Amino acid sequence: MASMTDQQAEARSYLSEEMIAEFKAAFDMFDADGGGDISVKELGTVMRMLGQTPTKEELDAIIEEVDEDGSGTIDFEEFLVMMVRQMKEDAGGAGGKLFDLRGKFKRPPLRRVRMSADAMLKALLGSKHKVCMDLRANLKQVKKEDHHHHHH
Ligand SMILES: C#Cc1cnc2nc(O)n(C(CC)CC)c2n1
Numbered sequence: 001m002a003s004m005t006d007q008q009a010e011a012r013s014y015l016s017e018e019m020i021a022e023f024k025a026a027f028d029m030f031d032a033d034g035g036g037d038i039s040v041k042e043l044g045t046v047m048r049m050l051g052q053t054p055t056k057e058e059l060d061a062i063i064e065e066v067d068e069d070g071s072g073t074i075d076f077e078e079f080l081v082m083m084v085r086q087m088k089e090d091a092g093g094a095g096g097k098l099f100d101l102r103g104k105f106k107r108p109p110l111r112r113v114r115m116s117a118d119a120m121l122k123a124l125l126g127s128k129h130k131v132c133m134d135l136r137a138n139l140k141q142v143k144k145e146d147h148h149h150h151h152h
């Protein structure tokens with residue numbers, strides 16, 4: 001835990017103390033059994049609950065690209081990286097788009113599309129979301145060396 005060379009450490013460092021305190025409630029979003037690991041099913045349930053409707057392949061992919069253990073599983077730090085992923089690409093991503101083409105007040109609705117991490121957390125947490133969403137990034141990014149090959 002001292003030799004920070006993983007993606008979880010980054011996630012933990014890209015957030016803020018009070019915001020992490022709010023993320024504590026994230027376990028309640030689905031609530032497996034009061035203490036357990038979450039899989040594509042459980043996760044897919046919560047995310048489809050916001051109106052979106054993807055495939056298991058989508059769920060696995062987003063977890064796999066961050067899963068260093070080679071097993072998509074959500075967990076203490078594994079959960080954290082998930083939440084940061086949406087805000088990460090929204091702040092500094094390449095190709096990632098919320099499909100928003102109107103940055104105004106009379107803008108389109110939820111549309112059941114990939115919206116901001118803020119909007120989703122507001123729905124997932126059930127309006128408990130009040131912390132300031134600050135993703136520590138800038139106008140700098142590059143290609144990652146992360147590319148896995150395995151099918152389960
Ligand atoms: C629950 C949940 C959750 C948390 N963090 C995410 N970051 C993402 O990109 N997603 C989905 C789209 C909402 C990927 C398909 C995330 N779902």
Ligand SMILES: [Ca+2]
Nearest residue numbers: 069071072073
């Ligand atoms: Ca895992």
